[model samples]
Target chain A: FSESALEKKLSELSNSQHSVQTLSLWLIHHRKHAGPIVSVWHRELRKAKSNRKLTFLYLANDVIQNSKRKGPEFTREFESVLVDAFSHVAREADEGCKKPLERLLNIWQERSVYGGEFIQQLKLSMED
Target chain B: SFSESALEKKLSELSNSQHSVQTLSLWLIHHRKHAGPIVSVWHRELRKAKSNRKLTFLYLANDVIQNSKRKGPEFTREFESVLVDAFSHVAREADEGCKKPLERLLNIWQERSVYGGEFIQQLKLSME
Candidate 1:
């Protein structure tokens, strides 16, 4: 998809399981565009509402987990901006938004998305 | 009456209301003997506090400083050491809500000279 189409997907993206799956597949299939894809995601993420912002990270989680089978491109692309993103989401977070975001951190730690040393920084940033 | 655990509860119960802030401020003023430990605990709790309540913690300190100044310099002098650090942390967020509220509080302090001219300038400088 063009960056325009990617923007549309992210803007209209729902938190449904199937919706995440569809976009994850499309993103993984287009993994060579990982840089721009992540750029769009981060940009749109900043503008996203607090609740929808949570959805943005879930989509990030989906793409990262699914694309790991192929290459390190997606994770590396996300790694640069993710700690900032986590802090952004967390500052606006309420009790309802936190439980899953915290749980997602555990899953990322377990899956070695960015490994213990780096993801630990993510958790620390999330805490503040 | 002057322990960290109970004081921590006070932060959790903290709201953005004048009554809640004033009530807790009164209690803190009443326990000025525990000033050192109370400051330490307040610092820690502010870092982990809910976002909405983070600014409320600063308001509590303001009330404490303003109300207790005639009795002694304990609260004012004790909190002075922490206010620069506090303002930096409190303003370090993406939430637009905290931005104006903090600036407005600065105006209040500036008008009343709640802090010394040097420290007031220092606090304003910290935000930049």
Candidate 2:
């Protein structure tokens, strides 16, 4: 799907019903390795509210797994976008939001080498 | 009091005996009240150990116990089972202080699960 097409779907995640959000995430996961999709993810994720940010964080695991299947190049791009998404949330999240963010960071760290570095960059950026 | 040196000593003596190690392990878990570099270090070590197929029961046990404390516990058998089975594999392969920590963690989680239902559900969804 085109980035604009996928961007529309990504928008639904923050405002749609739970089921619709799930389906939208499913479609995104299938196309997650695409550069345009990753770009949309980085942009849309920045605008997510606290709860919606958490949703996308969890939604990301499948996308990360999908990227891993495609090879390291795809995983690297996914990791970069993932870091951008996380940095947006970490910028203003309170303690409550921080814990889940920390947990997701740890989960991704366990998933891949690229994820570990992504986490480190997220943490360093958060500190800054 | 639990000092870093003492914790380091306990970690080094993992193969000494199950009872002592389990006692020290539980003590360290209690002492690690918040997430920090120590928890991150252990998480990295456990990931390395898992990949090498040289999984140590002590490392698995410590990671499970510490992670539950760091992020709060999820009492579902599915989540606990992942920890149990991974620890089981290590214990069977290189018998150490796995059993007690696994048992201890299960008992602790049963209590946490009741009060932590909402928290756990949020956690479960975030990882989807």
Candidate 3:
């Protein structure tokens, strides 16, 4: 709930499934404060290791998917900033490393997570 | 670990309520390994399912398909082989009242590229 506490949890985030799952669970549980939480998420994502950037995407994907069953708050919250997150992380990746992120875009595309034009823009973020 | 009969019962008992869709889709998401077999049962039951129960099945597929992509694309791939047939069967039997939404579902898939453009086009154009 505290902004500092959310930042601390994100600082401890790891690429392992258990780690991502653990944070994702807590984040969803505290989703009532999505504004600050997503801000922390984006901040941590920017500070994350390049090797772990994809994990950040996985965590975002996890939150986006799981929170929908609970409500729309997280989904809409994540939507606002994902473009920036995609842009920053894409520039961080080597050619091969960005493959997974593009694949993530494919999934988002198929699911209509964002509009077609927006999903295309997300892909372009990776290129820019 | 899983029961075919129990799934069949749930499928038969499926109603128009959000709770029913949510619970069954959650169950299916939990049993992601059984996607191939569960979808077989889904396709079989859909053939004999009452007219009103048909689109409810698609709603469940949409849920499981979209959600499962985060974990893996198994359900989406498994459902792919049968979706055109499923969409055709459901759309053909759907009354004039339900036709609009059915078209919209197809449109979303096309826009989102849930299946390939070819797949979605076939789903739309394969009809009389």
Candidate 4:
């Protein structure tokens, strides 16, 4: 997909369903549809999720690779939304966006077990 | 073309089902299906057996009876749903579809890796 196409697709994803449940389900669809793209998206989502002191090195590349929009304008939209999402999640009790994001990260980190069991484990993590 | 609504519905069902206790039970079912794919998940479950903190979601992935890294594509693909099917098991908790994966994350964090050949080692760590 071209940059514009990708951006449009991403933008569309937001309007399609603002709920995390919707986003997560669609993400699964994308993963099943195309591992490479989902792998990219999933990786970035993970980076945004695991915000620790030393986790950046583990997240930088996979996230930067598929960024459809860049520069200040993209930053305003993308980074702002990302920041806002994380901020909201941080204030809450349990992690939200961070949960799916972690699963995505684990998938990237563990490309070896890249299956549903790991995902099952991830789902388990997201619970209370 | 707009399976979006259907997808949303499906995702809603999946997401809402992530209640916690029940989800854990479901993953436990899938975990019962395999061990190599999720030995670490099972190991933790074994240690905490009655602890109510862990699920064998990592246990099943059973296979071979038929599966592994060296296995053919069919097995790998078959193994793919481990995460999704795992997610299928929702607990009564509000963590939604994420509780167990975090347990897996805890497993990943203490050591170095939880994917592939190293998972057995990680399982050993989880038991401790």
Top-DockQ candidate index: 4
Backbone clashes in each candidate structure, one number apiece? 0, 1, 0, 45
lDDT by residue (A35-128, candidate 1, tens digit) is: 9999999999989876687678778877877787799898778867765665566556533333433554476467543357654654555445
Residue lDDT tens for model 4, A1-128? 43344333433343122332344334333332333443344344444433331132212112222222222222122332333332332333254434443544365346654555555565554453
CAPRI band of model 3? incorrect
Residue pairs in candidate 1 whose N, alpha carbon or C atoms collide under 3 angstroms: none
lDDT digits (tens) for residues B1-128 of candidate 2: 75556655554455535565466556655665532433444434444453223344333344445445444443111233343334334334332222222234324434544214553344323322
Q: Candidate 2 at residue A98, lDDT? A: 31
Most accurate candidate by TM-score: 3
lDDT of model number 1: 0.72
Report the lDDT of model 3 for residue A54.
Answer: 68
When sorted by lDDT, best at the front, the candidate numbers are 3, 1, 2, 4
Winner on DockQ between 3 and 4 is 4
The interface RMSD values of the models, given in order, are 18.9, 18.4, 20.5, 15.0
Report lDDT (Cα) of residue A104, candidate 4.
Answer: 47
DockQ of candidate 1 relative to the true structure: 0.02
Chain A accuracy as TM-score for every candidate:
0.72, 0.54, 0.71, 0.22
Report every candidate's CA lDDT: 0.72, 0.46, 0.73, 0.36
**Could you arrange the candidates by DockQ from highest to lowest?**
4, 2, 3, 1
